[PDB]
Amino acid sequence: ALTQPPSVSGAPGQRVTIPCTGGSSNIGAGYSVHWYQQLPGTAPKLLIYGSNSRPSGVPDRFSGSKSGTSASLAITGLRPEDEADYYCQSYDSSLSGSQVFGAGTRVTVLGQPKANPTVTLFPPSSEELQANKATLVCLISDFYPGAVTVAWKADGSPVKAGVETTTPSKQSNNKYAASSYLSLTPEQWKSHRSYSCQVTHEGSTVEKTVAP
Amino acid sequence: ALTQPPSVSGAPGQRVTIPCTGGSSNIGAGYSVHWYQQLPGTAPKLLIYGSNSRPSGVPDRFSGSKSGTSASLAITGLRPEDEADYYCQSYDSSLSGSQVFGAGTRVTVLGQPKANPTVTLFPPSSEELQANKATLVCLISDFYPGAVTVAWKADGSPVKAGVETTTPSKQSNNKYAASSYLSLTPEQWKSHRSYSCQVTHEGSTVEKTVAP
Amino acid sequence: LQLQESGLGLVKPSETLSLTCTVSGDSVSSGSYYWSWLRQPPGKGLEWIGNMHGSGHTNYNPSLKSRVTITPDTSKNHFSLRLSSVTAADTAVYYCARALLTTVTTFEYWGQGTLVTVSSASTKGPSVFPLAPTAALGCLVKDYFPEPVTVSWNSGALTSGVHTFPAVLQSSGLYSLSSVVTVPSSSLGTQTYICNVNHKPSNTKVDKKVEPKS
Amino acid sequence: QLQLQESGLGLVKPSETLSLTCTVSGDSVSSGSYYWSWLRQPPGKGLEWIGNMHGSGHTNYNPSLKSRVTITPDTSKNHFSLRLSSVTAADTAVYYCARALLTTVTTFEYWGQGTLVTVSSASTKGPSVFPLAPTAALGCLVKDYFPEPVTVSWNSGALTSGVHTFPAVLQSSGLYSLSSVVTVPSSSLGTQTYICNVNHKPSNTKVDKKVEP
Amino acid sequence: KPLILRDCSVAGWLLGNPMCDEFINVPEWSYIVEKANPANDLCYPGNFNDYEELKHLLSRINHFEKIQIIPKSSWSDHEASSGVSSACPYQGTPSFFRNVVWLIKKNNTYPTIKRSYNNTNQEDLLILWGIHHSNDAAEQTKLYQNPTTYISVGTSTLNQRLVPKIAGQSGRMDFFWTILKPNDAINFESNGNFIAPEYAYKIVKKGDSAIV
Amino acid sequence: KPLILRDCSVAGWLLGNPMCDEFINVPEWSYIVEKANPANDLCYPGNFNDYEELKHLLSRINHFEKIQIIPKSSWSDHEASSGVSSACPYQGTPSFFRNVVWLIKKNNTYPTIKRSYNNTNQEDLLILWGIHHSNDAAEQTKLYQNPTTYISVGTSTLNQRLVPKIATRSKVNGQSGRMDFFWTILKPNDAINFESNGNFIAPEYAYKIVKKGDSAIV
Ligand SMILES: *[C@@H]1O[C@H](CO)[C@@H](O)[C@H](O)[C@H]1NC(C)=O
Ligand SMILES: *[C@@H]1O[C@H](CO)[C@@H](O)[C@H](O)[C@H]1NC(C)=O
């Protein structure tokens, strides 16, 4: 196996390097080290192969070296669009041989402006209501950084069960999305004056509300 | 199936009601509705059976009723030690018969004071380091209410991978516990000046730090 | 009267899940009671498996009737559950109970619960690492599957000040937990702190010595 | 343009055989200038190599999988196939197909898009679809399904601009839920029809929903 | 599907002869198939009163819900666990009808029972009980302390006061039944020879049955 | 574990004869087992230069790493995918050695090639190339637009300028032309320089000498 750090970080314009260290039966044996880039929602893509040989569409800024049992991907002139997972690959001569990979390193770009949660709250539909179910749906999109807490309120009083919330996932434009689901009974929905979705992000809370 | 709300809430001393509604082949068909209480870490316990008949050790304040296709557990004089999961039970005459249960309702008691997180942070052990692995352990205990965000920092800059965080769990004393784990490589651990675990709870951020 | 469940913690799919209930006081003979199995799947909700009467007459849940068997062992004060052809749907905390003979059966006395994971993922035992340090010290019980894991300190001789945190479920599907104990700074020292880790599905039994950094 | 696409079952019972095909367009699965390869990505993000296949019928498999893997071509359909026997939960992953150079550290040049495969032996469960009724926002709730994924489109693909399909939540029960929203002009809310098309292949769910104010 | 009583009679079933353990709980039935002279009837020798009348009612019942109306565990001053006879065996051991209780004296004393049960179920309740006619005066004091005893049962529509008629088993038992309408109460009073109710049957489903 | 060439030769293997696809990628070997007169050799007729000398070098090598040094996709002005022959079949179809590329004119023009490769792989690099001696003047122009051509190769320790020798030889495997093949070892940090205006069989893949020690041909 090759070993990478789970994450590295740098500020836009400076340089970051991702180490890849293996052993005497792969990198130390002299085999090439390849690199792949994986953008958040997509398949990996070939980044560097052989001895620092870039496929077309790969910029000069991406550069690979190798010394002894370790290899290194250097990314100079850091841009926010470099935020991806990078995997190193090599050959290992044990047992008729195997292609061998690292566990990926996440590059974080550090100079990035705060974006605030966009929150959309939806009441249960007529169709779901007549099936004697109910679900409030709270959607959070385009915030940075990707840490929120969501609290549901019923007539201003907290509701602490029947909630199902995602952890934030990176979107294609380097901001985060997340969503929260509140399970209710129809008689509960029809009882209260209103329900509220409370989203807290970077010390500021935004509340959306719906009603029967 | 019987259908109950996922949660109800009340303040100490007042009354809360848990509805349990079924159909023409169980409660509507005329069968009894039993009730069970499940405290957070433990097996359920019989609370009410038959027609509002309490086993020894169940107080007067617990009461069941039933009308048509729906039944009801009432709790008067809510005490904090009533915070538990309540399940309703009945018989359904479909297909040679079956014991049948609701999905359970969690009672939350509302007159409860904020408690702040106690945070304990540990550096990696020498044994793990010589196994070419590293893990920082951040432990959060005895806080209320049960909502926190954890942010890991490396030399004050955020680290956004290798983090593994629990969702808070209710303890025996009605407070919460939680923990976060950061995976590192040994040279990452030895390279930076220090790492910090930042825990944010109810508008206060608490930081602990470790170093090699 | 006490009821206690026991049996394998991890079971492969399509095989037969098996549990016994060990009963003490007024035993599975009688004939005044039902001897029952219930269960509780991930994302709770109680589910009934079946009742058995000491006479060998039984009443099973219609969703499972063909897979369930509940039998007594009067000469051992046991009764057993046997659930065949299991799938991930059978993952749950299982309880045994003694019940009244009411048609809406009255589960008067319950066992303690025993987790059973149906998975076909191979079990993996924990790596145990000391969390070095009134002071607090502990154990990291790392990368295991499935639940649960018991941790004790000095073979049970040390209980006051012990907090075993709930496990985390990593993205890999493996668990980690910590157990910490808080001790006098002054004894850190002359007093030895060993933590004992037990993971029955993988026959892992590990001692770890915990000291301050050197 | 060379394009690659994986396809096959999303849910596989354990101990059965996982089977996938890669459909190739813009080059033949002949000739011998390339390796035709499968890789996979388990939860626990790691990339893992499964094997390379050469049109001549020679193969190189991962030694940890050699005994279970099979990669074969179908030249008369421009497919090649992965066949993985005796699967367990350990084989749950996103699987990729790829076309590779003949380098001994093989160079995975062109990749497919990825296909999730869940090995579970839990029964599939299809979603309930409910309209999220409302410039304005509207959408579909795709509730309580297993396993991932679910594809959602609007007006059969005619509407892509302003569409955001959120990642699914994993409930404590082990079921998934997601929402899709599309942002539209208030003025058309109105006279324009908004239909959302939901697909959950392991349970053969194909549901259209009209979304109205 | 029919209820096929095997070698058990209606009395045996409804009273709960340990020989009839197949019918401790019986799913909904269409009609009832009884034999001509069933082997398993009254455990202990005696007579089942208004048997034909009750069998007739059964032609209009499709399912019973058995409930517990007087917990065995609630006889503080009487012995409720040693009322068994080798006439009523269970697994070759002395037992007794499962639905009723043969109360015996505790510490050479049988305090007057003054028990009462209000039908708070929403349905008609079928209740069975009995009286024991002992052999001789000696048997009479050995079981109950009181030589001069009575059974007293009453509802809005029932008035029973019986005196035991003293003269493998050489004594007899009489059994009786009544239907308790919703919201009516039944009152029991005795100072000996009383076979108390433990379980009773809610008449939950009606429509057409028949005895065959 | 030994490398068992079957009916394939050292030349067939290193050039990448389509009949030798078993050896497209070869794990580490102890020694090499070759037959006396192997069936699958130079599928396109010709000669392999300093063959005995290369074989000797192989007696000191335990493993190769195949790298791509000139992407086939990087011949902008030359056609690199139709230099195939019925002498070199793959599944009964026209093919060619896998490790080298038979460049042909594209759009009726064969511009002078001035290519170069610097050895940044940290190990000795084994590089093969060839020249095509065509049948007659007609075939020369059919393939390359230019009737007067040359191959030019040079490193620090190599200076080659070859001219195709046009005349129609007796057919071998359908073919009346020939090919000469050549190889060199490119030391770390040295460069090889390629230049031609026709008849050049270019490198695509080359071999890093990654493992050494005692081997042998048998
Ligand atoms: C071929 O060459 C001519 C003359 O240089 C040029 O104008 C023409 O566009 C070329 N055709 C192609 C397809 O490149
Ligand atoms: C090859 O590259 C190295 C390092 O980039 C350089 O120092 C060397 O001079 C180059 N060789 C030639 C022949 O240009």
Q: CA–CA separation, A51 vs A31, rounded Å? A: 10
Q: How many CB atoms lie within 10 A of CB D146?
A: 23
Residue from F117, F118, F187 to probe ligand 2 pocket by mutation (most atoms less than 8 Å from CB)? F118
Q: Which of D30, D60, D102 sits opposite F98 (nearest CB)?
A: D102
Residue that has been written with the tokens 């209000």 in this structure: E118
Tokens, residue D15: 């101990």
- Ligand in nearest proximity to the CA of F108: 1
Return the CATH class of domain D1-121.
mainly beta
> How many angstroms separate the alpha carbon of residue F78 from the centre of ligand 1?
13
Q: What are the structure tokens assigned to D98, written together? A: 């790829």
Cβ–Cβ below 8 Å for D179 and A137: yes
Q: Are A138 and A121 in contact (CB under 8 A)?
A: yes
Say how far apart CA B73 and CA A59 lie, in whole Å.
68
Residue B49 burial class via C-beta count within 10 angstroms: exposed 0-12, middle 13-18, buried 19 and up: buried
Residue nearest to atom 4 of ligand 2 (CA): F189
Same domain membership, residue B136 and residue B97: no
Same domain, B116 and B211: yes
Kindly tell me whether chain F and chain E come into contact, counting contact as 3+ Cβ pairs under 8 Å: no
Residues of chain B in contact with residue C46, where contact means CB-CB under 8 angstroms, are: 36, 44, 87, 89, 101-102, 104
Residues of C within 8 A of D89 (CB-CB) are 119-121, 173
Q: What is the CATH number of the domain that holds A70?
A: 2.60.40.10
- C98 close to E (CB below 8 A): no
Centre of ligand 1 from the C-alpha of residue A119, in Å: 57
- Interface partners of chain F (CB pairs < 8 Å, 3 or more) are A, D
In D, minimum Cα distance to F93 occurs at D31
Tokens for C127?
């790596």
Give the end-to-end CA distance of chain F in Å, rounded to a whole number: 14
Q: Which chain B residues are closer than 8 Å to C110 by Cβ? A: 43-46
Q: How far apart are CA D131 and CA D134, in angstroms?
A: 9
| Structure determined via | X-ray
Least Cα separation, residue A91 to chain D (angstroms): 5
Residue numbers in F near A46 (CB within 8 A): none
Ligand nearest to the CA of F109: 1
Q: Does one domain contain both A93 and A107?
A: yes
Residue F118 Cβ contacting ligand 2 at under 6 Å: yes
Interface of E with C in 20-79 (CB under 8 A): 21-22, 24-25, 64-68, 72
Looking from the CA of residue F191, the nearest atom of ligand 2 is: 13
Q: What residues make up the domain containing F94?
A: 1-218
Identify the bridge partners of residue B98 per DSSP, sorted by sequence position: B92
**Contact between chains at A43 and D104 (C-beta distance less than 8 A):** no
Q: What torsion do the CA atoms of B147, B153, B158, B162 make, to the nearest 10 degrees?
A: -80
- CA–CA separation, D81 vs D97, rounded Å? 9
Residue B190 parent element (H or E): helix B186-191
B40 and B56 part of one domain: yes
The domain C1-120 belongs to what CATH superfamily? Immunoglobulins (2.60.40.10)
Q: Which residue, D172, D89, D58, D179, is CA-closest to D127?
A: D179
What CATH number does the domain located at D122-212 have? 2.60.40.10
For the stretch D1-5, contacts whose Cβ atoms lie closer than 8 Å and that sit 24 or more positions apart, written own/partner, are: D1/D26, D2/D26, D2/D27, D2/D99, D2/D110, D4/D97, D4/D98, D4/D99, D4/D110, D4/D111, D4/D112, D4/D113, D5/D97, D5/D112, D5/D113
Decide: C140 and C131 in contact? Cβ < 8 Å: yes
Last residue of a domain, one of A111, A134, A161: A111
Neighbours of chain E (3+ CB pairs under 8 A): B, C
Instruction: Collect all residues with Cβ–Cβ distance below 8 Å to D87 and sequence separation of at least 6.
Output: D12, D14, D15, D16, D17, D18, D119
* A64 and A54 share one domain: yes
Distances (CA, A) of F208 to A72, D168, F58: 20, 48, 12
Resolution in A: 2.8
CA F116 – CA D113 distance, rounded (Å): 36
Residue nearest to atom 11 of ligand 2 (CA): F190
Q: Which amino acid is at B194?
A: S
- In short, whether F49's Cβ falls inside 6 Å of ligand 2 is no
- For A203, B114, B140, B147, B201, the CA distances from B204, given in Å and listed in that order, are 9, 12, 14, 12, 5
CA distance A97 to chain F (A): 6
Domain count, chain A: 2
Distance CA D187, CA F69 (A): 60
Name the residue at shortest CA distance from atom 10 of ligand 2: F189
A122 and A96 both lie in a single domain: no
Phi, psi of F73, deg, nearest 5: -75, 10
Integer CA distances (angstroms), F211 to A68, D86, E135, F28, F56, in order: 15, 37, 107, 8, 15
Distance between C69 CA and the closest CA of chain E, angstroms: 17
* D96 CB within 8 Å of a chain A CB: yes
In CATH, what class is C121-211? mainly beta
B58 plus B79 within the same structural domain: yes
C54 touches chain E (CB under 8 A): yes
Nearest to F68 among D30, D54, D103 (CB): D103
d(CA C183, CA C181): 6
* Nearest-Cα residue of chain E relative to residue C100: E68
What CA–CA distance (Å, rounded) separates C133 from C214?
11
**Contact across the interface for A95 and D172, Cβ inside 8 Å:** no
Cis peptide before C148 (omega within 30 of 0): yes
Q: How far is D175 from chain C (nearest CA, A)?
A: 10
Sheet strands (E) in chain C: 2-6, 10-11, 17-24, 34-40, 47-53, 58-60, 68-73, 78-83, 92-99, 107-110, 114-118, 127-131, 135-144, 150-153, 162-164, 168-169, 175-183, 193-199, 204-210
Q: Which atom of ligand 2 is nearest to the CA of F156?
A: 13
Contact criterion met (CB below 8 Å) for E173 and E130 = yes
CA dihedral D200, D204, D205, D207 (to 10 degrees): 120
Among chain D residues, the shortest Cα distance to A53 is held by D107
Q: What's the Rg (C-alpha) of chain B?
A: 24
CATH number (domain holding residue F133): 3.90.209.20
Instruction: Give me the residue from F28, F67, F211 closest to A32, CB to CB.
Output: F67
Q: Please state the domain count of chain E.
A: 1
**The pair of three-digit structure tokens given for residue C187, joined into one six-digit string:** 């004894």
Domain edge (last residue) among A85, A111, A137:
A111
> Taking CB atoms and an 8 Å limit, are B166 and C44 in contact across chains?
no
Scanning every residue of chain D, which has its alpha carbon at the shortest distance from the alpha carbon of A4?
D46
Alpha helices in C60-136 (DSSP H): none
* A and F touching (3 or more beta-carbon pairs closer than 8 Å): yes
A96 in reach of chain F (CB within 8 A) = yes
* Domain extent for B147: 112-212
Instruction: State whether D56 and F91 contact (CB < 8 Å).
Output: yes
User: Is the shortest distance between the CB of F93 and ligand 2 below 6 Å?
Assistant: no
Contact D139, D181 (CB under 8 A): yes
Closest C-alpha residue for ligand 2 atom 2: F189
User: In Å, how far are A36, F48, F53, F147, F210 from F23, measured between CA atoms?
Assistant: 27, 18, 21, 37, 17
Q: Looking at the complex, does the CB of residue A31 fall below 8 Å from at least one CB of chain F?
A: yes
Spatial contact of B38 and B104, defined as CB atoms under 8 Å apart: yes
How many residues does the structure list for chain B?
212
Supply the DSSP string of F50-95, one letter for each residue. THHHHHHHHTTEEEEEEEESS-GGG-SSEE-S---EEEEEETTEEE
Does residue F217 line the site of ligand 2, with CB under 6 A?
Answer: no
Of the candidates A156, A165, A167, A163, the residue with the CA atom closest to the CA atom of residue A183:
A163
Residues A192 and A126 in one domain: yes
| Number of Cβ within a 10 Å radius of residue B127 | 15
Calculate the CA dihedral of residues D91, D152, A139, D177 and round it to 10 degrees.
-50
Q: Do A43 and D113 touch (CB under 8 A)?
A: yes
CA distance D98 to chain A (A): 10
* Phi and psi at residue F142, to the nearest 5°: -65, -30
Query: Sign of the CA dihedral B129, B131, B134, B135?
Result: negative
Distance CA E178, CA E206 (A): 17
**Per the CB < 8 Å rule, is B179 touching C131?**
no
Q: What are the domain boundaries of chain C?
A: 1-120, 121-211
Apex D165 CA angle, D2 and B103, nearest 5: 130
Q: Residue C181: how many CA atoms within 13 Å on its side-chain side?
A: 22
Q: Closest Cα of chain A to D75: distance in Å?
A: 25
**For ligand 2, atom 7: residue with the closest CA:** F189
Strands C47-53 and C58-60: antiparallel
Which residues, in sequence order, are CB contacts of E82 under 8 Å at separation 6+?
Answer: E104
Q: Is F116 in the pocket of ligand 2 (CB under 6 A)?
A: no
- Whether B95 and B144 share a structural domain: no
Report CB contact under 8 Å: C170, D121. no
In this structure, the number of other CB atoms found within 10 A of the CB of residue A67 comes to 9
CA C5, C7, C11, C17 torsion-angle sign:
negative
Residue F115 CA neighbour count, 13 Å, CB half: 24
A162 close contact with B: CB closer than 8 A: yes
Nearest CA residue ID for atom 9, ligand 2: F189
Task: With residue D23 as reference, give the H or E element that holds it.
Answer: strand D18-25
Query: Using CA atoms, how far apart are residues C27 and C33, in angstroms rounded to an integer?
Result: 10
Query: A133 and A80 in one domain?
Result: no
How many pairs of residues across B and C have Cβ atoms under 8 Å apart? 125
- Contact by Cβ (8 Å): B107, B84: yes
